[PDB]
Design a protein around this nucleic acid. Sequence first.
RNA 1: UUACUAAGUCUCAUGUACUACAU
RNA 2: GUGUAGUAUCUGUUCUUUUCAGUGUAACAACUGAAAUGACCUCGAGGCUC
Lengths: 402, 812, 92, 83, 427, 142
Amino acid sequence: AKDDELYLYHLTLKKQTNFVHSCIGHFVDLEAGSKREQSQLCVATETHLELYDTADGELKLIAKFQNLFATITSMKSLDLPWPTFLALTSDSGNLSIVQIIMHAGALRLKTLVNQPLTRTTLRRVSPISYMEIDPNGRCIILSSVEQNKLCFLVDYAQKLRISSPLEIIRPHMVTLDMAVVDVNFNNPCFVTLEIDNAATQLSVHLIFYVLELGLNHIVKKADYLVNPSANFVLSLPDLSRYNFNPFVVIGFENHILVKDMNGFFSLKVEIPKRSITNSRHKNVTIISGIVQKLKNDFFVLLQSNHGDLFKLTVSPDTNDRNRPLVQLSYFDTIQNSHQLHIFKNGYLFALSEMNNNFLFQFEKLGVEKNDFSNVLTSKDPNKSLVFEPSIKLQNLSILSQQ
Amino acid sequence: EKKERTLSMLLLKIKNGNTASRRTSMRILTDKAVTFGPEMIFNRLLPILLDRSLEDQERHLMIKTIDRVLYQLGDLTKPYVHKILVVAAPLLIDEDPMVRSTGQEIITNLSTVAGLKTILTVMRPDIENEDEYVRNVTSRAAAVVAKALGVNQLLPFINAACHSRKSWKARHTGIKIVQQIGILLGIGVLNHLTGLMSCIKDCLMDDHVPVRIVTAHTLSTLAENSYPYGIEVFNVVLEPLWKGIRSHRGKVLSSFLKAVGSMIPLMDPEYAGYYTTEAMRIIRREFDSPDDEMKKTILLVLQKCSAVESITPKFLREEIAPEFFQKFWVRRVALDRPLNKVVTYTTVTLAKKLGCSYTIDKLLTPLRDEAEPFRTMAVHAVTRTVNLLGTADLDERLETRLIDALLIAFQEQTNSDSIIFKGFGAVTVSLDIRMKPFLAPIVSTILNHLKHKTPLVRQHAADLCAILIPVIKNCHEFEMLNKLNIILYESLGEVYPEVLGSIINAMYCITSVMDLDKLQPPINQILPTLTPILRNKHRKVEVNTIKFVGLIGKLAPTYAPPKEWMRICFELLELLKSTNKEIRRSANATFGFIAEAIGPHDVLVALLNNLKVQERQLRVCTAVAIGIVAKVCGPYNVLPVIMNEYTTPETNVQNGVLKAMSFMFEYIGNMSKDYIYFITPLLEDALTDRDLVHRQTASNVITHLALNCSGTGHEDAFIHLMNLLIPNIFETSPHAIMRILEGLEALSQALGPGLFMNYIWAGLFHPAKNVRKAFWRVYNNMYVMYQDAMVPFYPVTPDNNEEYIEELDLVL
Amino acid sequence: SRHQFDLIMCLKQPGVQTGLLCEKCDGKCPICDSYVRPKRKVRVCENCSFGKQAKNCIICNLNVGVNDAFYCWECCRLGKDKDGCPRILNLG
Amino acid sequence: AEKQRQLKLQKIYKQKYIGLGDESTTREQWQRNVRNDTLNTLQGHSASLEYVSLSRGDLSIRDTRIHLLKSMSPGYKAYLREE
Amino acid sequence: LDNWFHVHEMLQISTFRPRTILSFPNNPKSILFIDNHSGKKQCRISLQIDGECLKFGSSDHLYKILDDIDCVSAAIIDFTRQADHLIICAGDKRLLTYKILVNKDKLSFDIELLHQTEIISPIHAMLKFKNFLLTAMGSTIVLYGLGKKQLLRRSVTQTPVSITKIVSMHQWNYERLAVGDIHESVTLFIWDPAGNVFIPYVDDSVKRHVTVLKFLDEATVIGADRYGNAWTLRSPPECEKIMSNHDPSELSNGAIKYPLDVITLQQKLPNTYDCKFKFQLLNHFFVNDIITDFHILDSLSNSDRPGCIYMGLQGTVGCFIPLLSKGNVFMMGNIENIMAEADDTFYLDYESRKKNNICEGSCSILGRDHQEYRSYYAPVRKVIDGDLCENFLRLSLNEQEFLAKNLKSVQVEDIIQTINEVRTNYM
Amino acid sequence: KRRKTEKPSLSQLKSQVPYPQIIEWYDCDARYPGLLASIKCTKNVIPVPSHWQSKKEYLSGRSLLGKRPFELPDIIKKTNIEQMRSTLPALDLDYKKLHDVFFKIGANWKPDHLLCFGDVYYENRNLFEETNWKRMVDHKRP
RNA sequence: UUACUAAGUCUCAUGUACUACAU
RNA sequence: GUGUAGUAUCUGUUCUUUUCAGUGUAACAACUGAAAUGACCUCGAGGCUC
């Protein structure tokens, strides 16, 4: 008898286009004998992976790498004191640090060290889905949505060396939005928002962690309870000019906070709102913050659910004392973008979770901090600014779309 | 607070007692050290480990306890700084690396307990110890305290306390602490490189020669720690280092050369040539060292310079080759072990740069010399050069001279010199196709070394013949095969087991290079002669005999009567589970060819009949033989006869069948997929059988079979196999319960959770308090292996649970 | 272990280090003690390495091992490979 | 001895993998594990996350993700009720 | 190999977010688009045929705006061969009928509102039955005819208790149906004339959340999952014999002789076997995307083997090609088996050379095994994954020749031949 | 005590159930009966094999005494090793023969009985009689 | 035309295997 | 062809304080505590019995 047994041949004709992860490192040196430039980006969708360069002000396919056959749940580049190779975490729990290399006549992706963690599946205990690397590249940190957090201390030698994992386990605390604060080599410090899994009331509390290179463990530092409305954390780099004390930006829904590590300074600045507020209007939120610093001027870009792109700068408030202030303003906005990067060049790569990734070069850079009209301050935390969006697109200029 | 003394007895409970009972003492003392008294606590903790009875594990436990006490008693550890500094100092200077590591850890913990000011006030007045050992211990203690309490945290205090001119003691102790910190930190001297060089440069032009030597040693240690890159700070003292090479005298020039040897490889490419030319005025001139401290330093400096890319091979052949060959390349160091190692290493490192032919045609005299002492080192260096470079740089006259020297060294092997034995094979491999024209020389050498009838001599000759067997016999000669086989099978009854193993290895190499009947010993005679040799209990002898019997049936699978091969297989079946894994691998490697040459049906019937005999102490190995005989054509020749052996009514036989089926499946990953359906009617009577043993081992079959056959598309058969398993979940006993759990987990992979779930769900809670405890085991393992995999399969509906999830019903 | 019951395991997050097994225990998958088609080298937490105890056979806990232990292909699919740190703390 | 080890491995596996029904587990305890894992995978796969984002119609996708995160805790229902 | 397509399409953002896409049965390709507004409920309809779109009437606008109409689900129907109607289901739970017009050398689309009908359910799924609209309520399947002043219920079929809602459904030549669920899986129905009802004749094995569903054949069904499983099921030959040898009218009531086992499964397990048959799993696969649309094409660029191509939500398009003969799937299966553990083979070679003198995930770059990743939710059954064997093409000649030595079969060159054969010949 | 006496009647539990005939008297003491009825009565779940609540260790069966030891699958019985080796109270074979039996002859071959989605084997059951039954419904016709 | 189910626990005996241990 | 200790498994045999309450059990079982004595009526059951 003929066996039915339909034999199907699966092919991926066009590969998954929703880009969930990106990294800013400089991986391969191509077409140039000796060149080192930080401008390049590698972007990953789950299985599929791609590597783009710009260097021209216009984005370029470099090579579409072979199918990894896994779910990449986070990807972050690491830079150590060298060719910058990206640390990649996926299902199987393996922390896989891969370097993009030129082999034969094509670019192939080589793996250096993969460390077994959890098991093979997409899990809550699985220390993936939340990942970040020390901006100086000294240590990589993975965490889990709920159970536990692991942080490896990365060291380079004639062969790469991953230090033994540093474990912290909080049973009932569901972790969300890992954001690591840069440091001067003092000590790595990462910040999370822990929502309690088992509780009578909904409680979302931020928590700070300082990994101690001396004692080789992660230390709970400041546990600050904030309203359940909390959304995300971003890292303010220094505030060295104003008054180790890191400061974080906690995006809430209808307003923004920034908090000290020592709790000395908690600044509430209400996020402005559109003029139309069409039909259903949420309290919104900010989906993606990012930081940039040049010439003593550091501003951050935080975009709302409507796509409104905002900046923050810090003012000493010379009249009172030297103390931080927080100043919102308005930009060209954009469509909703999952993640934002900035080259050493003035190019700002906007990775949209919606449809298309597109790159910019900013010139106007936005309104000056002097104007009291359109800019909000931490002077009075209770205040509201209505603004009509601008389709004229003055501040940002689209260079390339994907 | 006398109970803290009893806590010392509790410390005994941490030492003498159970692991949890021992860790409980530390966990309790961690929350009680603050309420115990720093004085008595230290007075009871320090002498406990200070005694010589502190074992390795005891030392580790004491170190952990002291670290916990310091972490609890941070400020209280200040008054006790004079105690641990007097206790941890000698332990840090111990012989074993573990002792020094524990001492350094204890010192770092004591430093981190108090502040840097306490460590400074403790280590500063300790410089009055006029004893060199006490001074070195204090310097190492200060270095360890600075390596953990911050290098720049103690850098200014040390630079302000050592930059004075009190006496030579402080000036020496400063450089000593600097070198100790640079050695303890390691690669962490990059940022503090210039910060330390700024304070260490005060000794490069110091008046006292001792301070200058200490500064040179510290600079060399820093260059070795911060090597190879990062020579920027090295330029701060690079000029004096390159100038004073031929300026100091005795110890000063020695220290300068020792520092330059480390600074040269880390230097750049431009200034490296100038530094080498400036140092050669005092290096090549003083190549002949009156003592060993100068000779070893010069050898290390020459090796480091050869490693550097600055001085090319031309400069080495011009100004480095003649001096190195005159003052160093000689038999004047035939007894200095350290010198014999250092010169050999330097020559091996420099041969790759100066060309192997440049030394292969210049070292053909030290090996052929009558002095066996220097001849051993010469042969070692020659073998190292041949292994590093290879056989390219080999001239005709040079090759002839090397062959003559090797033959003279092997013939004049008056002592047990394994260097020549190890280098003969390397030289034969370097010969390659040239060994054919040089055949009769090595042939006569091996004949004279084999017919000598000396035990160690015959062993070395057999080893050298087995090493160079494939190069000589495989030269397409067909003339030396008989001359080799006649002498090979002659000394077959050697009482020495090592000589017997060497002869067996040589015969195996000959049989691999020779054929039937090209081999000199007849197959019909070597087979019965080698048959009783396999019965010997010698490890190496049996390991070689197994491979010999296997290779005997390689090209020629016949050369035997079937009864002889069957007897050999029956004899070797008992050695398939020996202690040494090499014999276990050789047995399986030989039995495959043995069964391929004998026949499938005969070997299968023999193995089946052997199942009932050889009761279950070594019976399972016979089953492995069934699984080892079904790897040449697959398990389609072993399985049918197995199934009949299961048709046999005897229990123990059926068990051996089911287990043999398990193992034969785990040894084949991709094979069982096609064989799965023929198995299920056998497991039909297995899983249904009343005996918990048959149900157990059948489940063990389903484990491997399901794991390796999972995803093939046989789930419909797997569904059956499971449907018979589910009723066995409630079966008790540890073996049955774990075999059945593992079986069901294997079924989770072949079926996927969904159906396996469906069973687990319909039994998931239940009132029975027993059924529940049983199924929640399977659901625990399922939750361990799969979570996301089970997510879609939770039978949860809005009426099933209150909250449910509002987002599952969303449809777009 | 799979056979001897009283043997206790470690089960922590494995580090970069690789566990050693003695020539006597060579070839066993540390979970199932199987000799077939090994896959990935065992990795143990740093807490099981440190000093002399690092040299011990992760299986028999007594002898000093030269060889690395590998998981089999059945345990690598069962995921017990990634379960945690295999070691035998109690001698049994 | 063997079962006694299975108790310890029950404690360890329960610690790592959180909810594992041992013998007696309340429907509130277990259903919470169900909800937590289902939401966990809905937000965990960028795929299903993108899906729930559109079918729900939220203005941004991270609203859906952090929604699921918040939805993991029981009090989030009353939290929505208090808005 | 990387692209296999070209995409023909200040800041530009449209307030209208698209909803669904439709095409007329009679016109071979005429594609009608329906969008929504983010804001007050609003819609637009943009029809295109041939090169670019159409004008609306004599107006400049190329699209139509529908105020207060939002579309939860929509499908176009032709009640008569000469008339073309459009079907909207509003979130107000109202069924709206329209009429499409093509002006033909004045050519333009003219949409015309006909009727208004209230609906109990949201109507997540509807399709074209013969002469009729075949729609699915939440619980039940209604078959609407064409009435005037509004459309009428011609027949209603009450679902088995298991089905809560119907995500999607599809028909086979008007005789048969496959009806999907949110929670539960596909269940096939048959239309019985003069019985005026669909009778379920088969259940499905396991619980699967089916987003989109199609027919390859009469007896087999394609389906995807909310979670990314791509599967295909087949009715058992025991059922195919019965339905081939019997009329549907005898299924619900009347004499149909079922083997002893089926009835014993009815009284023994009434919940699972209520539909008295079960789908034996035929093909199963996991594509990490969420498949939006399956389409079964009798030929892909004239190729003989008919393929099925799917577009995923996160975006992707992929195909399942049935392999003729056997040694096609034997060679393909062997190549996939090679590339599966190839990383482990490299690790064992790299291990042996270290015994005589590269991590484990070297070749895969990630720890996931192929069979493990592609298995995932449920093990792949007969489907061999070509996306793996394609990676064999990029590897260097040394690596490829290192891998193919495990086969007594043909050389690397013929391997690459068979691999590249699929895109050429099969599409 | 109070919780044991707090239990709702099984018929009170039937109304919550879409397929009430599966629920049984012992479901009254289900600690979460409203839930257990929903799970047990969910579509595709396969009720626990009923050999629990019996202390017979699942096999005391009198029928187990009369079960046949084994029967070769006829395709393997073609290989003739049955005559070569007598299992009931050496035989040279061909590699091509055995290999072809499993592959050439027996590729499409499958066991005749197997079992279905929810088939569960109770102690008193014997599949063989049902195999001859299914085969007989096939051969014999009016 | 008979619409398919019986032994259990205890006690004191018989039947039969077995496990460490010694000549 | 023996002895020491010990185990398992048949089969035979037999039904342990009538009740109450608690534990326990899926329900049993099992376990834990106490104790009615007297009178009458109908066909081992029965009593808004005293």
